[PDB]
Ligand binder design. Structure first.
Ligand SMILES: C=C/C(C)=C/[C@@]1(C)SC(=O)C(C)=C1O
Ligand SMILES: C=C/C(C)=C/[C@@]1(C)SC(=O)C(C)=C1O
Ligand SMILES: [Cl-]
Ligand SMILES: [Cl-]
Lengths: 403, 403
């Protein structure tokens, strides 16, 4: 069975819905701002890709009481995706053929910490309250969505650090391929908080030299890049079996024609490059059209950026796709990056443009021989690819093509 | 393609390897002990199923520096499983056909809380150090294993709260069915700590009336049960494509002949039963032999224990299987429970016995008319079923059959 994407939803540093996101991608607009929270926490990195949305009252009191911010962002993204897919409650609720696979990289460090802080204070268990497990547990995002949306089919999270939501989408495709589900909502969410951000800063992973000019801090492939800019948000796509989609007159963005998932088996916090080569080739297998555009993982990290370019050069030789790292605009939403970047790639495919790789003032030498696009470019695209990698040497690649 | 289990490994409250666990299961031996740590934290529950193993020095410094306890337990279990399977590094390392899918329910609240506590002191980032992300991330159990074991295939965690490691095993089976992998190491780990346990005590989920008699606190189906006894540990199984196993002269414990995964879409912290019925039925589809023994999820919770029994009655009608709840001995290892219980079930199948459901002093009225086995019973078994459920209404069932 073939799998297609029939709806999308997104809450991102560059837009609270697909219209805002589309506009930001075309304008090369930064979603990065200064964070007093990060500064106050004692961090060296004081910049972030924040969600600019008051979520007060957007979710029913009895539903939101179980949720951390990752789940809030994923839930709002799922609402958007359902509306976009034209799915009525009757179409998707209480239906064993309809599932949900969505995760987070971090879960909720904020709520893990809150539980322990509260426990150590004067009210102990009463301060902790009865909602911390569903906030803090690694599967919060799937649990907190599958329940209120009345999902009856598969319900779990994939967790693979910064590749999380890409593997969620690939696993959704597998459920369609195995004939087990007709629809799977796939994606993820990530909270933004010093509790988690400080652990990345403590390993030197985050940008620290550009706090005074937050919009210039995330600068994938620039020779003066100095680490990623942390971000939060959510995204969800509707992954649907092809015949089921056509039969209901769904709007189809693209077919997922390739999914690679591989492992480096090498280093914990630096990529081998070879795993990414294998992952991309796996996702390309049997795909009879060229890759027109590649949304790189492209974190703005000295080692990572060029390791991935070396991998791309090995896979494509002298026939580079157009490449841009949208993280230079959006920052790195960790477990939510894969689905948000799939969505950016789908919007490029749907609207016929390539988003720019911004903030390259001096292009890294190793981008020579490749097609790094630094200006918004109108172009009819047919096949797009998006890479996601995570600590632990975990790799995901998705290839999406017009029908 | 057919999937078989060809090796197993376990670190549990009732033994540090399969020899010790087999002896405990046969003896009805409790793994539950009084915890001064839980009491000192201010919790109401003072009992736990602790791993009784000094793990100091068992793992290379450069590997273990990235790890939390969940990953240590899973890593040791995976070493045992490789040795049990008879796999040389030549066979399983740097092999694109060999993967790893293993997770935890909670990641590491201990290390997340350590990060935040350290950061909030006078030394900030320097006190946190560079190892907290990998110790605290949700995917630690897969990341920290796929890397040192030189895994090149799939590498990610499934997370689904108390169903986590059962969904990991089922997803491994799917990899074999899709023809993508020949071997997938599947399982999970969970740390044991007040930081996480207090979240469950705060929702009233933990046993609190039996602290003076720790070995009696976990008492699935007993009329005076009063919640679960939290535990930690790990487990790993080698899931392997059948022809690949036969060709190498593998020792085959069982074939995974069924895998159910469903969703309640109902309540966050209580099961509907309806989802469980569908999950068991899904796992039995095409399985042409009766269930000889069912290892229930059976947590020792007032609502959960009997909701699952009602679902069992609906699925099996007038032919109910022998049942036991091994958590009355072992406690509830959360994300590690699914793989550990699959392993207890495989030991029962391999050695021909049913482990007892202990501490039933007065059987719940809603458990009447079922064969809840309360004394170790030698019996030749052929087909066994094991259920795992988690918060968020996530359900998994595995059915395993002699080849
Ligand atoms: C095995 C280590 C890997 C893939 C590291 C990468 C490139 S993936 C990522 O999101 C960041 C920030 C990195 O540094
Ligand atoms: C949807 C909620 C569910 C399945 C709750 C269960 C029965 S699963 C579990 O491990 C425990 C302790 C429970 O209470
Ligand atoms: Cl347009
Ligand atoms: Cl024996």
């Amino acid at each position: 069975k073939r799998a297609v994407i029939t709806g999308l939803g997104i809450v991102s540093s560059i837009g609270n819905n697909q219209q805002e996101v589309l506009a930001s991608l075309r304008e090369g607009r930064s979603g990065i701002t200064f964070s007093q929270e990060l500064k106050d926490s004692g961090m060296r990195s004081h910049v972030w890709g924040n969600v600019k949305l008051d979520t007060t009252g957007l979710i029913d009191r009895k539903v939101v009481r179980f949720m951390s911010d990752a789940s809030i962002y994923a839930f709002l993204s799922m609402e958007q995706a359902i509306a976009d897919a034209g799915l009525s409650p009757e179409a998707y609720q209480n239906n064993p053929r309809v599932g949900l696979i969505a995760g987070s990289g971090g879960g909720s460090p904020r709520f893990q910490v809150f539980g322990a802080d509260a426990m150590r204070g004067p009210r102990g268990l009463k301060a902790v309250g009865p909602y911390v497990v569903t906030k803090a547990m690694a599967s919060g995002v799937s649990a907190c969505l599958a329940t209120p949306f009345k999902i009856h089919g598969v319900n779990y999270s994939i967790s693979s650090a910064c590749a999380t939501s890409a593997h969620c989408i690939g696993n959704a495709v597998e459920q369609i391929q195995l004939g087990k589900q007709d629809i799977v909502f796939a994606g993820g969410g990530e909270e933004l908080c010093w509790e988690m951000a400080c652990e990345f800063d403590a390993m030197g992973a985050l940008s620290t030299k550009y706090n005074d000019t937050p919009e210039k801090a995330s600068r994938t492939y620039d020779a003066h890049r100095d680490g990623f800019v942390i971000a939060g948000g959510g995204g969800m796509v509707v992954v649907e079996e092809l015949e089921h989609a056509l039969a209901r007159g769904a709007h189809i963005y693209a077919e997922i024609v390739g999914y690679g998932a591989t492992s480096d088996g090498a280093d914990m916090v630096a990529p081998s490059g070879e795993g990414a080569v294998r992952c991309m080739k796996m996702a390309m297998h049997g795909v009879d059209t060229p890759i027109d555009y590649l949304n790189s993982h492209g974190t703005s990290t000295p080692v990572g950026d060029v390791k991935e370019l070396a991998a791309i050069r090995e896979v494509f030789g002298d026939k580079s796709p157009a490449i841009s790292a949208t993280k230079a605009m959006t920052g790195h939403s960790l477990g939510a990056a894969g689905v948000q970047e799939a969505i950016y790639s789908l919007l490029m495919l749907e609207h016929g443009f390539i988003a720019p790789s911004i903030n390259i003032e001096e292009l890294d030498e190793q981008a020579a021989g490749l097609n790094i696009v630094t200006e918004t470019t109108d172009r009819e695209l047919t096949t797009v690819m998006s890479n996601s990698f995570g600590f632990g040497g975990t790799n995901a690649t998705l290839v999406m093509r017009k029908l």
